[PDB]
Design a protein around this nucleic acid. Sequence first.
DNA 1: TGGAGAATCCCGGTGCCGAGGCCGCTCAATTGGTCGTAGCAAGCTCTAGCACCGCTTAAACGCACGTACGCGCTGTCCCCCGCGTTTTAACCGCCAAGGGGATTACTCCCTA
Length: 71
Amino acid sequence: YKKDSPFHVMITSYQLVVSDVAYFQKMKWQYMILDEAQAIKSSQSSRWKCLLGFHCRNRLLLTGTPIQNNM
DNA sequence: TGGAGAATCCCGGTGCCGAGGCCGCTCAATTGGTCGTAGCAAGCTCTAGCACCGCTTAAACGCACGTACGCGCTGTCCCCCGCGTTTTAACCGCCAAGGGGATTACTCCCTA
């Protein structure tokens, strides 16, 4: 997108990237941020399984408590 | 027959919204191979379906005859229609609630 574009940064709930996943996986993302990435900490979670498969160049996991319960 | 008026048509204008077409994906239809079987073909039995004959009688049928019931015809009325006034509540819009369900979190113990 260039500066003349309908949007630049989109902000979304973890609830919607799962619910609207079929719309999200039909688009190509130039960068991704994940606030409180402890939400992604479980590999059996759909929000992990969904966001794993997003077509994105670069990703940040923002967290303050990375280690959590287990390796 | 005529007529007036009320009801229905038709013609043109406006709008909206849903049908028909386009695009992504997927997943469910198709290709190719294996294996079992099931139902198709032959052969045997003999079951019961068909045909025929002769007797019996009881069910059918032609006709007599009446009277019981179908239907047109008259009278009445009352009760349902048609139309004007009154009233209500059906329809629409917009917000609210919550209630259900699927995902996520984290311990505890069954079971492999």
